[model samples]
Target: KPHVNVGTIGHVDHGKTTLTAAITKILAEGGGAKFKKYEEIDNAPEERARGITINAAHVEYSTAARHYAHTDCPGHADYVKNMITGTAPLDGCILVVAANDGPMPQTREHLLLARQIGVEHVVVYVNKADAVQDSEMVELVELEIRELLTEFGYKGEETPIIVGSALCALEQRDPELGLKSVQKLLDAVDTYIPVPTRDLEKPFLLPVESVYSIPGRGTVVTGTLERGILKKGDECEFLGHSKNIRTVVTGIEMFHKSLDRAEAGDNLGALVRGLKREDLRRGLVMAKPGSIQPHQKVEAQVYILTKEEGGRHKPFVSHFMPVMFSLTWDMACRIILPPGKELAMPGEDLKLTLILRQPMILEKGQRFTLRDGNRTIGTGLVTDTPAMTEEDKNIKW
Candidate 1:
């Protein structure tokens, strides 16, 4: 069976978690707690209190031809911190929208994020469909969804839209047509989402997203395998700006348990020959000799979140503002849109150059993001590394 990493994206309180839990229940015959435990509680405690997903959570299940791992991303901007950096491993995304509310601000942002990340396959689930009484309203909502997706370069006509209530479906355990919907989703995955085709036959490169220190395990870094594979005792380079350290794979853990070998798509935690917590940041990339290059500048195409008037009047700007560089999710940077340039308004597309405070590995045509407070305000794709500069500051969009 082919393995696909899929993310659940949408506005807060739109049943993303409920749908995540429901789908896991359907596929695994219970919620997928055993595959990869994201939080200790059924819902993360912070998420329960806030009534929203505060972090990315993972659960795994199997289909006839695919092993599906689902990632639930926080819908709120403030909680989107690691989500933007951690989506490097996802093969595609399943966007959840409330049938009654249709597309909200975050829904659009999530769709834009998917595109920016280079996810070729995207599926839309109009959740809570059971609550809607009018077929006309459903058609109206579908039209709006289709139009919105079309505006974002998605072939909306081709993108699959499933109408169902995640809550009702979950309660019933086996909805009258539950299997049909699941099959529709899986078919889309098989056709639209391409398997990651990294140069696995070469050296190795893996970015660190989450790190843990166990009593006997020492230190382990968890992230999507970017390239190559690891056998025991293979010498590897832990790439970061603080210091490039040489280490050996003393041990490998897939998901959370020990494994003799680790390959691409294996969300892994590795015990290294020599490494310390301070030496690794959340976004660090690991590679074998000369496998990946880190860059300090990038060029991207960005869309600014506009207000009702379609522009940011008296817009706020700062150096510490967080921005996603493009789709790999591991690479992001604080943006300094040059002074005296016009601030972006909603619905406007602008091309800008970025300066990274830290060195990050990126390839051309990668998707990225920019955030205001915790809300994602802009989406971009990397067009150039070692971003070029222009002397003119009076440029208008």
Candidate 2:
């Protein structure tokens, strides 16, 4: 079955998670239109305790023509890393907006992040529609959504907006229409979103997301294949930790079902020999020999977000201005470029080199975000292997 990764994104308390929960139950093997609803998403104890999503949760369901791996992303400002992390594996976005609150701060920013990540397909769910009886408010909210979408470079009315209260669906309050709201969202996913184009023809590369020792299965490493393919008995290498591990792919599995081969865009676990639980670690890469490597420094275009979303933060100055950097499954400390000059401010764009503490497998145009404290400072694009840029002038304060 063809799979598409869709991210559920919105502001805090906007019912993003609830909508995803409705999708899970309504699309589960037996949990369909006739099934009772569950209002909670795939939540952990801590997340539930705080009544907020803190981590990115994955849930699987099928939409007739396609299977989906929906990521329930955290909406709170404190967890923007988890939010951006969820965007890493997305094919499209399901932007949930509340009827009462048209577009909150994070709601608008999440849409911007989706667009920045290059997501062209979106199906907005105007949530909590049943809470308000005013049709005028609904119309106004839809218009506001269109304005925000247009500003973010997305389609407007032409883009489908399925409006309904997920809470109402969970409580069976839609007397005029049963679970039809849920079905409408699912159907929109099937028809509006297209599967992401993949380049299986590119060099084989799979960033190691996790490693496990499965009793009898030796060592298992799991990650979504960013590009290329891997099959049983294929030779590969793991890069990280200032070293490399050469190994052979003994087997591969998706959801415990064994497969002789896996292709680009597959989220699977591959069994390997020559690496033990001790030798294995997270944030590593398994690829054909010399196919990829970790770079300790890179120069790129850094686009800072707005003050509200970007937060009051440091100026990435000097050669070793320290900050946290996230790329793929790897997180490390880094210096923001121009060693001695303060090139960028809170909401400005400039060229800088993010010097990684550890080498990371970065391409010419890979995207990453820089964070400090609980605030997301800015995002960047890899432009070179090291700091060299066409535009390096510091922004005048």
**Candidate with best TM-score:** 2
Tens digits of per-residue lDDT for model 1, 1-397: 7778887878887877767766765666544355433233135433321112234566777766778776675445522432333333677888788888889998887776666556666788778777777877778888898888887768889888887777765565446435456556656666776765665686767778877777765777777786688766777776655356777878887755678887776778878765766666666777776676766567665655445322243354534356553323343455555556555445455556666545666565555666545565665666567643463122221
Off by over 4 Å in 1: 30-42, 45-54, 173-179, 199-335, 338-397
Model 2 scores a C-alpha lDDT of 0.71
Taking every candidate in turn, the Cα RMSD to the unseen true structure, in Å, is 10.4, 9.4
**Predicted structure 1: lDDT:** 0.64
CA shift of 324, model 2, Å = 11
Summing lDDT over every window of 10 consecutive residues in candidate 2, give the lowest-scoring window.
44-53
Indicate which candidate wins on lDDT: 2
Off by over 4 Å in 2: 29-42, 45-54, 86-88, 175-178, 201-365, 368-397
Query: What is each predicted model's overall lDDT from 0 to 1?
Result: 0.64, 0.71
